[PDB]
Amino acid sequence: SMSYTWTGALITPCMVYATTSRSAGLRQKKVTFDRLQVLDDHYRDVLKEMKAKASTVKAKLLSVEEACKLTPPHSAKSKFGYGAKDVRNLSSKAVNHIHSVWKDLLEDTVTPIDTTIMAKNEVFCVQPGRKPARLIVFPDLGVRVCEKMALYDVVSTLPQVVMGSSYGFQYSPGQRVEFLVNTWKSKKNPMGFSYDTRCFDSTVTENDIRVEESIYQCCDLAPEARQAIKSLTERLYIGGPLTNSKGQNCGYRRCRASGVLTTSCGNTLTCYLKASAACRAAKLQDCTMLVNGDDLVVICESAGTQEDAASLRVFTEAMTRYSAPPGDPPQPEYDLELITSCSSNVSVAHDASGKRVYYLTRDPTTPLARAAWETARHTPVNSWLGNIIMYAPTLWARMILMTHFFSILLAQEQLEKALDCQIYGACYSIEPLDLPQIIERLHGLSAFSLHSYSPGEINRVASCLRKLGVPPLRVWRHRARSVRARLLSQGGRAATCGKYLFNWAVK
């Protein structure tokens, strides 16, 4: 089958650079291809094991109300006169239509379902050119609430129990490091590698979705749930029409929709299944996986330099047969720090006592680029704040990000003003003054004492600043002392930010 099709209809809209609709042409050519898929007894065996595990799972329907209350606030309004606000506040219009969409889902297991197609507002930095915008594919809100009724309890319960510790989304960054480090130190001669699929969504075939759905039906589910999950699978997950923002038939989809509820769960599942099958084809020794969508880490016992190199090609051929080839091929590492997945890697520093502490970090290019963008521009995600939060132990987050921004707020008296900020698919109203508790909850107090960072990490950050035009770290130690003292002068809450978030600056 063909991954996508176009009718010719133009997807219309609704240094540092945001991606635009104008780039969507190429993105389109890149994600359209025919899918070759051929499965073996390795794929099957894995599947059977996931099903066994899915059979120990009972899931329940969410009521309309529950699904309504777990619709996110700033999600797209519906083609039927109601906001997501209206959904959240249980408006009779939202609820009534929702019920009819649900009745419609039970009564009809066939008619495809309209999905509105669009381009994403993703910011990026430059390479050595312009990466285009990814295209997001979602159905009407009324349908997205129904999706939650039928599958919310499944997607938030099943994956963890089917994939155990390999399920990446269960982990905070510290927990993720904890798992990756333990895995590593459990191999006599560890070898690991990141894998990632060349536009994964488009590689997800119809069969993968039918397989996925069949993993879902392995759960103990309400009769109505089963029906809506069959029906949603048939009328939405396997495919359906596209339609740009000006209501024009853009063509059709025959692969994963990016903007549905089963996307994160499905990709992780489907990815995990193929990767496990592929481990067994490559004959990798004592293997261990970590899967967040299509981003994958495998840690295993090394079989030798050449043996490992070879087996990774065999691992890739196998993945390819299952329709999932890599963007760039996988490369073996014998050094944990060198593995980048989820755009991030494990690295080391030292806490107050002088104990080694592992923590997650990443190339700071994009975070800085977005933080730049968002300095001259009000933003609904505020990725700068999200990054400070997630990567709070990181040298680059503490010295550049935290520093610059508490300077801007200080100067602009906005140290009490809440900001919307999206992390872990949730949208928080975050008050800057609250960061200490957050970081303490998320990484513990050691995140304010991290020092003596690995020399590789220090270099990468330094390199990165000189590349983007941003002052060296010497400046940021000076500037920080003058943001910290300013705050202590302010007492109470503000002084707590200075005590904790900038304690690294006192000589």
Ligand SMILES: CN(C)CCN(C)[C@H]1COc2ccccc2-c2c(C3CCCCC3)c3ccc(C(=O)O)cc3n2C1
């Ligand atoms: C010196 N000035 C005339 C010219 C600076 N330009 C080239 C600018 C582009 O702006 C940027 C673009 C992409 C990445 C970084 C920067 C940048 C940042 C970001 C750092 C992280 C917080 C958000 C701003 C800067 C912060 C401070 C400074 C500074 O001049 O001290 C510069 C920063 N830049 C570089």
Ligand SMILES: [Mn+2]
């Ligand atoms: Mn990918």
Ligand SMILES: [Mn+2]
């Ligand atoms: Mn990926």
